Amino acid sequence: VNVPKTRRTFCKKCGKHQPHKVTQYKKGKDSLYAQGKRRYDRKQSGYGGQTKPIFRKKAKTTKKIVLRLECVEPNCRSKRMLAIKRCKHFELGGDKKRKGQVIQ
Amino acid sequence: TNTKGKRRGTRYMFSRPFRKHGVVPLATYMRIYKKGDIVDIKGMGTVQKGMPHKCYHGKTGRVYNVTQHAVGIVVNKQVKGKILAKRINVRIEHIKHSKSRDSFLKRVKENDQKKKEAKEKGTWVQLKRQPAPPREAHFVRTNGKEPELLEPIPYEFMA
Amino acid sequence: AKSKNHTTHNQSRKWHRNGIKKPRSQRYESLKGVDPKFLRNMRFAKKHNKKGLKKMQANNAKAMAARAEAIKALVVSRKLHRLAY
RNA sequence: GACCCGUCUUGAAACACGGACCAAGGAGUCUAACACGUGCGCGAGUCGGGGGCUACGAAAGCCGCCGUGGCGCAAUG
RNA sequence: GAAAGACUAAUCGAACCAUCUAGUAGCUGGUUCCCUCCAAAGUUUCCCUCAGGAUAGCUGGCGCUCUCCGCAGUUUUAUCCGGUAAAGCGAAUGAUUAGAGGUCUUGGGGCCGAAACGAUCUCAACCUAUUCUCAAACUUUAAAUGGGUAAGAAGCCCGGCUCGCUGGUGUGGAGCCGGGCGUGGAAUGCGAGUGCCUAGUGGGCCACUUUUGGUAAGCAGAACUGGCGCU
RNA sequence: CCGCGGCGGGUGUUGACGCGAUGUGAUUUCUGCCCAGUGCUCUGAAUGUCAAAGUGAAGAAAUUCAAUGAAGCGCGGGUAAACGGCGGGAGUAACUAUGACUCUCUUAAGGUAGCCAAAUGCCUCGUCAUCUAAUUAGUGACGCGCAUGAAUGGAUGAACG
RNA sequence: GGGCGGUACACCUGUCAAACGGUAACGCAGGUGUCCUAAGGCGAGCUCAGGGAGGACAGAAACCUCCCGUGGAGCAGAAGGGCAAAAGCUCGCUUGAUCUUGAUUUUCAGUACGAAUACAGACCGUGAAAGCGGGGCCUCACGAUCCUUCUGACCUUUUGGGUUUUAAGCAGGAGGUGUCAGAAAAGUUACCACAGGGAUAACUGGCUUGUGGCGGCCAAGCGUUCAUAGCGACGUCGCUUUUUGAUCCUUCGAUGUCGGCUCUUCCUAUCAUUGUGAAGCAGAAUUCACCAAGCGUUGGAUUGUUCACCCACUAAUAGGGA
RNA sequence: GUCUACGGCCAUACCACCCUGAACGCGCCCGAUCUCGUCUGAUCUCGGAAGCUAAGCAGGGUCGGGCCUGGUUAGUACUUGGAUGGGAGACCGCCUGGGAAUACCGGGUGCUGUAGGCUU
RNA sequence: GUCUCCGUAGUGUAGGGUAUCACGUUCGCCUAACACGCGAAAGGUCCUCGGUUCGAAACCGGGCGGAAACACCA
RNA sequence: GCCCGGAUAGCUCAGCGUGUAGAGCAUCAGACUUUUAAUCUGAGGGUCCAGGGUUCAAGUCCCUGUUCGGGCGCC
């Protein structure tokens, strides 16, 4: 697929429709002081070894895609997420096709 | 193990009748539908929005809701032994009136006409529908000639 | 090592040992599933009915007298017949 | 007229299995909790189970400024 | 162990004796007195589920509110729905046989030809009217059985009120306070209604017709009713 | 090499003609080519990855981020009497013509000396000669060997069972 | 039967389905785990495949022009259904593929996820307009707790009070479990052990007879000539259980499992002998058929052999069951 | 009999060839300053009015195709229920009741429920 | 036990708009003749019928032929 | 997911931010009285794909299409 960089849409805090700025999303790093990590290391240590399961039978080969819509008017500066259907190939804002040219 | 799709086995059912394709005629829409009327359901393949599921094609129920382009409706269904009373929301194309109630609404009026009249006359006019009785003894006149003697045909190989 | 799969052999009777119940029908059927624009205006009209009782009261208290003045302005053989007398 | 009884089994007289013969012994019990029916007392209240006081009796009878406490009378986030 | 998994108190591909111990089992066998009343299932969804359990179903028990209007594995009268058996190619979608008239619509060869649709025998396809047979995944038509609804008081008919929705016009509807109208508005038969707790079962079999695979089977697999299992 | 343990114990009252750990199997006779693979070992700042500790900075601090970074794996040499491996592209003459000499080369080299239808060869009772009146077995030979072969040992030969 | 081999283990499209609906098998013919800022959402304007008649190089087929032209074209993919001043083709303007409570349908326990339809409260796109639009014309294209990550509000809690860091909180998307209502998992045992099963194989026996074996009808030809002395093409009707298959009914708290030696009996579809017919039967030899199973049907080399093959004798060296 | 906007399944209303068309009407026709568009004033848009019956127009015609209804095909094909009814089997008869479709032969070719201006 | 290739001048054999090599073999070239070497011949139902095609042998099956394969586990 | 290096004429293959090298095939000639071997020209280059910034890119950065190392693992 191919999406443009600026979409005009709703905003919660402002009330109206406003133009945005589009970029995609990457995960954050796992922090080490979070509760399921202060529990997993505290339970993991000592003898006994592996306790919680480990996933190995990975089947599918694709991710859902999530957009990160940021506002533009410099007083709001709010952000919200967005979801799109599955795809393998992906980009943002470049070289939109046309109608009727010479196909080799 | 057959499939469980939305439109299984509806090749001939949602199809248009022969030489009746094309545009939906404009006296289907501008008829009026109140609440309480009795309605039969016939599917249609042109306007795909708001179709009924294939297990209602022929049933008949009454209205409880009217919407901007649709009416709600209460029907009955039989699932594995019992009977459920379920309600849908159907667009106008897939819907007609039923004329089943009308010969009753023509016989309530005819009876009350046959009752207001001739009650003050002290007359006793029959009101109940009575089934077709056994027919009366009657004469048959054969003026002149005799009945025509039949003969069973002798066989020959037609082919 | 096989096994039968699907059947429907005794179920057209196994249903009729306790009857096929028509759905319990009943007057004053509910209002769940109606559009809120119609149901709002019916609710405010069910909330301001006690505003116009007197003209309704006297206009029902006039036909009781027009009817009481209108109703006031309106008001086999012979041997067998003997033996059944 | 009439195949030998118990047993799994769609299907036992079976070329399916256990059984030579008699007497005694032998297999859904015991607590805790909860749910519903049912019988009894008191009733917006109820309960002394733990504690005290006066041969059968290791029983019974009392205590209310010993009713603290339990469940109930008021739910929701 | 000069080797075979040999021997180690008649015991060895991990000895013997006691304890935790009465170890676990969806798996085999057995399960102790009489009569009376009611009486089944081997199907559904989900499960590392297919010898098993949960769930709905069928069944029994205890009662309850009414009767001492209501319902029905049925029929009639009105009404809509369906694409099966039959049939049909002179009708579409596909398959297919043989002649008949035409101009060539084009060719491979005769053929006279320095050329032709000039003439050609034509085999041939091409166009028009005709003809022989076919169809689960093709259809113009289109039965039999069969599937829902309706058969009056929860209806009709007269006043009037409220509305913040709809609106040219109290228009358009809906909801409300009131009054009036019973020959009970097809036939036949019958007392009905709801509310709890819950055992057993989920290995199924045969025939009439209808029907798929298979050369056929006392074979395998489905639909309608009925039986043995339970006699 | 043992062992729960210590300045513990055996080998060891021993010292390379000695302890310990392996594969082959007398003598005679020969022991072929391949270090890409899996192992093994050696040069390692010739360096890509690499914990704890100790160091620096920003912060009120808990913290967070950076430099540096041992062995070993990686990269580079050695080794087959270490496990183990040893196929293919169709004809090249001057008469049959199997076939000279090759053709031909792709993924580490591509079955040499020698032996056979054997205790190893499916087709199979292979074909030839002999042994018998008649021999799916025996003995001798041919090799194209489903799937023979060199210390996972090949061919040998008196005595003995 | 297991195994090797497959996916009927989640979905959709036609068919089986017996004219509502529902409905099975390792039953058929087929496909999917995606693709697209336009191939989504509005509006104007046009009409396709094929066919004819013509036209410079131009031909079977380039482009132009005229007429017929109910879909014979196209709509991203499988197939049905659906479409003509459009749902197609060509241009214009945009981001309703956005934000938020519920109700209902779909398979179904009438539970979920998934998908979808009607409404309602906001902001926008559009077309003068009426209105159409909250994702692909419809029928498939996807996912639980627990944990993690991100955003959201001048949010509540961070525990003797108060302030700032951190963590825990409530709401919405994402990080995936294809055995698809969701465990984290490679082999062998011929040294083998226990719990059970005829629900499930290896023998026999049963029902069946395609394959094997045996016998008929019809009559184009062969037979120096002459269809049927003996034979029989393309075709067609049956029996037999001595071959192999198919199935799985009975036995797995055991019916002792290949061959041969020895030993009785039985069947006839007759190799020889007894009595009789036809020949392309002169005699001698030989082939063909009828009544007929009382009596016979051998000795040996090689192989574990049933089977085969070869040397002799003979009247003949026929075939099988229990 | 005509114009405007329609209704119903939209064919009794379609298609092909002919013909007559009074008056009001509809239309081809005359043209390109007026920000309507095109390569092109043909189409679309505008300003018009000398001149005339081909026109999806209107009406009738064809021993017309087509369609719409009726007989024949036919109590045939098929079929719900049943029988110790045949038959080696394939399949066929009976009682009970329901009951089609082509070919072939006949008749019809727009009603206008419709509101406004109009043969008046 | 039956599935996988492929069939073409006399031999054997290369490959959607013609039937091609090499050898087999007739005549001709250099030479002193000789050998080697060279150039022009004949040779074709590209297995037998029907469809895709403007034109198919190379595309499609049905079919007859040959060869090389396979059947495992009591 | 972390970091890391690798792709150039028909085969192997050089490239030093200011230019497309090379060796081996295929042609044509020259050298030898004639064959062999060696000698030389010529024909072939999109530097694996888009961008950047620089006067100038094959070259540093950036990502996407292709091969590979290594250490790691809670849905």
Ligand SMILES: CN(CC[C@H](N)CC(=O)N[C@H]1C=C[C@H](n2ccc(N)nc2=O)O[C@@H]1C(=O)O)C(=N)N
């Ligand atoms: C596995 N074996 C075979 C011996 C087994 N332990 C016992 C045995 O007889 N097993 C064999 C017996 C039956 C089994 N078999 C054979 C054919 C068949 N159609 N189905 C079977 O189940 O095949 C087995 C087989 O040998 O592998 C060996 N290690 N040799």
Ligand SMILES: [Mg+2]
């Ligand atoms: Mg540790």
Ligand SMILES: [Mg+2]
């Ligand atoms: Mg079952």
Ligand SMILES: [Mg+2]
């Ligand atoms: Mg007797």
Ligand SMILES: [Mg+2]
């Ligand atoms: Mg038992």
Ligand SMILES: [Mg+2]
């Ligand atoms: Mg059991």
Ligand SMILES: [Mg+2]
């Ligand atoms: Mg059994």
Ligand SMILES: [Mg+2]
């Ligand atoms: Mg039973």
Ligand SMILES: [Mg+2]
């Ligand atoms: Mg018994």
Ligand SMILES: [Mg+2]
């Ligand atoms: Mg037993």
Ligand SMILES: [Mg+2]
């Ligand atoms: Mg016994």
Ligand SMILES: [Mg+2]
């Ligand atoms: Mg006793």
Ligand SMILES: [Mg+2]
């Ligand atoms: Mg109680």
Ligand SMILES: [Mg+2]
């Ligand atoms: Mg010893």
Ligand SMILES: [Mg+2]
């Ligand atoms: Mg051993």
Ligand SMILES: [Mg+2]
């Ligand atoms: Mg042990």
